[PDB]
Design a protein around this motif. Structure first.
Motif, PDB file in Angstrom:
ATOM      1  N   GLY A  81      34.421  34.922  36.991  1.00  0.00           N
ATOM      2  CA  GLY A  81      35.024  33.942  38.010  1.00  0.00           C
ATOM      3  C   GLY A  81      35.899  34.574  38.902  1.00  0.00           C
ATOM      4  O   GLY A  81      35.675  35.787  39.219  1.00  0.00           O
ATOM      5  N   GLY A  82      36.309  33.544  39.666  1.00  0.00           N
ATOM      6  CA  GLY A  82      37.284  33.961  40.900  1.00  0.00           C
ATOM      7  C   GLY A  82      38.453  34.698  40.716  1.00  0.00           C
ATOM      8  O   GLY A  82      39.114  34.510  39.586  1.00  0.00           O
ATOM      9  N   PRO A  83      38.947  35.452  41.544  1.00  0.00           N
ATOM     10  CA  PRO A  83      40.036  36.229  41.047  1.00  0.00           C
ATOM     11  C   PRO A  83      41.427  35.393  41.191  1.00  0.00           C
ATOM     12  O   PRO A  83      41.685  34.730  41.982  1.00  0.00           O
ATOM     13  CB  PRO A  83      40.348  37.173  42.317  1.00  0.00           C
ATOM     14  N   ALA A  84      42.310  35.564  39.876  1.00  0.00           N
ATOM     15  CA  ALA A  84      43.677  34.923  39.899  1.00  0.00           C
ATOM     16  C   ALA A  84      44.550  35.717  40.947  1.00  0.00           C
ATOM     17  O   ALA A  84      44.117  36.681  41.743  1.00  0.00           O
ATOM     18  CB  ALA A  84      44.107  35.084  38.736  1.00  0.00           C
ATOM     19  N   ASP A  85      45.739  35.307  41.101  1.00  0.00           N
ATOM     20  CA  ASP A  85      46.937  36.015  41.854  1.00  0.00           C
ATOM     21  C   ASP A  85      46.842  37.544  41.419  1.00  0.00           C
ATOM     22  O   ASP A  85      47.121  38.384  42.420  1.00  0.00           O
ATOM     23  CB  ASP A  85      48.184  35.192  41.864  1.00  0.00           C
ATOM     24  N   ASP A  86      46.863  37.920  40.400  1.00  0.00           N
ATOM     25  CA  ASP A  86      47.066  38.971  39.702  1.00  0.00           C
ATOM     26  C   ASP A  86      45.665  39.932  39.925  1.00  0.00           C
ATOM     27  O   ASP A  86      45.709  41.086  39.829  1.00  0.00           O
ATOM     28  CB  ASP A  86      47.478  39.297  38.399  1.00  0.00           C
ATOM     29  N   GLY A  87      44.606  39.200  40.308  1.00  0.00           N
ATOM     30  CA  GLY A  87      43.453  39.837  40.606  1.00  0.00           C
ATOM     31  C   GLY A  87      42.518  39.927  39.427  1.00  0.00           C
ATOM     32  O   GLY A  87      41.239  40.259  39.498  1.00  0.00           O
ATOM     33  N   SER A  88      42.907  39.272  38.269  1.00  0.00           N
ATOM     34  CA  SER A  88      42.137  39.116  36.985  1.00  0.00           C
ATOM     35  C   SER A  88      40.894  38.195  37.246  1.00  0.00           C
ATOM     36  O   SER A  88      41.196  37.141  37.926  1.00  0.00           O
ATOM     37  CB  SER A  88      42.913  39.012  35.919  1.00  0.00           C
ATOM     38  N   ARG A  89      39.770  38.379  36.511  1.00  0.00           N
ATOM     39  CA  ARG A  89      38.807  37.408  36.661  1.00  0.00           C
ATOM     40  C   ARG A  89      38.394  36.987  35.002  1.00  0.00           C
ATOM     41  O   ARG A  89      38.170  38.293  34.300  1.00  0.00           O
ATOM     42  CB  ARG A  89      37.802  37.975  37.387  1.00  0.00           C
ATOM     43  N   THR A  90      38.206  35.757  34.874  1.00  0.00           N
ATOM     44  CA  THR A  90      37.247  35.361  33.337  1.00  0.00           C
ATOM     45  C   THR A  90      36.087  36.083  33.639  1.00  0.00           C
ATOM     46  O   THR A  90      35.367  36.073  34.703  1.00  0.00           O
ATOM     47  CB  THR A  90      37.306  34.123  33.442  1.00  0.00           C
TER      48      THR A  90
END
Lengths: 281, 276
Positions: free
Chosen positions: A97-106
């Protein structure tokens, strides 16, 4: 040829192509697995059914994460066995998945059997950036085998496992020695793991060869078999050095139903750390 | 080959592969275009720069919709031109969103040049299921050419446009005859469009050959001698190579199109193509 079709090559023994998904800032890896194209998968079968090891899914997830600069496997839950059909192929997909604000991806792993009309999900998890590297192994792997660790006679063990239902073929029979120390939840298992020469060239192309990582963990079972469950939840998996073929490993219990792993190569450099693996029947 | 890598072949002259995206119920078509692989692309160039025609992007969008049961192009907004390198390839992606309650899906066209580090978006829009009965042409094409429409001598017209900077090569020089009825904002352009010999054979491979649709609309330019938003495009019949066409102007800055084949069968209708 991935490139003539408008994708990139994955340069990986289990994955065919990668393509970015500009629409979502995600990406997707594609693969087709068969027993004829990946014969060594036959060496991991549970009740005579070829299934991609949990560790193969881990390797896929971490390869995808690394493509996007998210190499750390924060969490991976294994949902359903990725069965490899004894004839034909199964289409495999790793979706990041695309990056969250923390940069984590599913990350999700899917498969589509040739016969099938719908995809099956096999694992779902989260990859995160490496904020701060590890340096060196925590455990003293230089004093080896460890003081007061008693060696376990392995004679017959891989047979006793086959009987219970675990069918490890030659690729996966990589546990070379096991020592044990402690008794209860304070049990440590130490092992030397080395892939057979047949697997060597492949090993070099992986992040970590799923058979190397599997043996690292199934040393605990080999240990017990000298006196079925599958990996369920992975937490905090990091690959530190790529393409190893021989390990020294320490496996311990953070809780009564879980394992942690630290493994180094023969030069003593870190290869893999695992905060937690929980299993289920 | 595609199946080898874990995708499906697209079976379309401008697309390589397609794969479903179970993470989103979307799908994605991938392609690599080059003038070596797709020589006829060179025949659409603006000021010497090879651009995939807007109709090209329409053709990909509708083909992507077909894959998903969303064959009708409700809207396509063209953003940045899709440049084809003179040498080496450009990577193209058509991305189709998951279905809304509608059944409607987003569509987005991207490209990646041989060393950019970023994708460029070329087009974005919406596809929808076919909810209408089989189409009937609104205009009487059987009375041809139309009453009171005047013939337009096309001699030298394409060459005119070529100096203005419209480099239509042989594939795209498909306007054969034009009649004009009215003037200024009220003018109807009636044209006979036919692909040249080599593209004509290949026309059955397309939904509609982008050169045929391009020429259907640029009959207006030829008659007089890069657009922005498409609205309401339905492809009624596949694989046409020869059209009769009526182009009208819904607003002073837009065109509408109805086109039929040689036997009078409806081929393509387009509510509006707007310039801005």
């Amino acid at each position: 040829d991935a490139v003539s079709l408008g994708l990139a090559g994955a340069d990986h023994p289990l994955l065919g192509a990668v393509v970015q998904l500009p629409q979502s800032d995600g990406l997707v890896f594609t693969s087709r697995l068969s027993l004829r194209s990946h014969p060594w998968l036959a060496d991991h079968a549970v009740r005579d059914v070829v299934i991609v090891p949990g560790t193969g899914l881990v390797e896929l997830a971490v390869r995808a994460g690394d493509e996007a600069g998210c190499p750390v496997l924060d969490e991976l839950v294994i949902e359903a066995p990725l069965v490899v059909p004894r004839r034909g192929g199964v289409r495999v997909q790793v979706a990041l998945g695309g990056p969250a604000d923390d940069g984590s991806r599913t990350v999700d792993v899917f498969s589509l059997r040739e016969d099938a009309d719908s995809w099956l999900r096999h694992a779902t998890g989260v990859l995160v950036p490496e904020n701060r590297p590890r340096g060196t192994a925590a455990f003293d792997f230089a004093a080896w085998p460890p003081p007061e660790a008693k060696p376990v006679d392995l004679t017959g063990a891989y047979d006793v496992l086959a009987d219970v239902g675990y069918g490890y073929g030659p690729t996966f029979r990589a546990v070379r020695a096991v020592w044990r120390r402690g008794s209860g939840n304070t049990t440590e298992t130490f092992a030397e793991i080395a892939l057979p020469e047949d697997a060597r060239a492949e090993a070099g192309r992986f992040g970590i060869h799923p058979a190397l990582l599997d043996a690292a963990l199934h040393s605990t079972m080999v240990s017990a078999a000298a006196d079925v469950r599958l990996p369920f939840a992975w937490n905090g998996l990091r690959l530190h050095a790529a393409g190893a073929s021989v390990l020294r490993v320490r496996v311990a219990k953070p809780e009564r139903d879980s394992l942690s792993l630290e493994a180094v190569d023969e030069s003593g450099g870190l290869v893999v750390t695992l905060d937690s693996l929980v299993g289920r029947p």
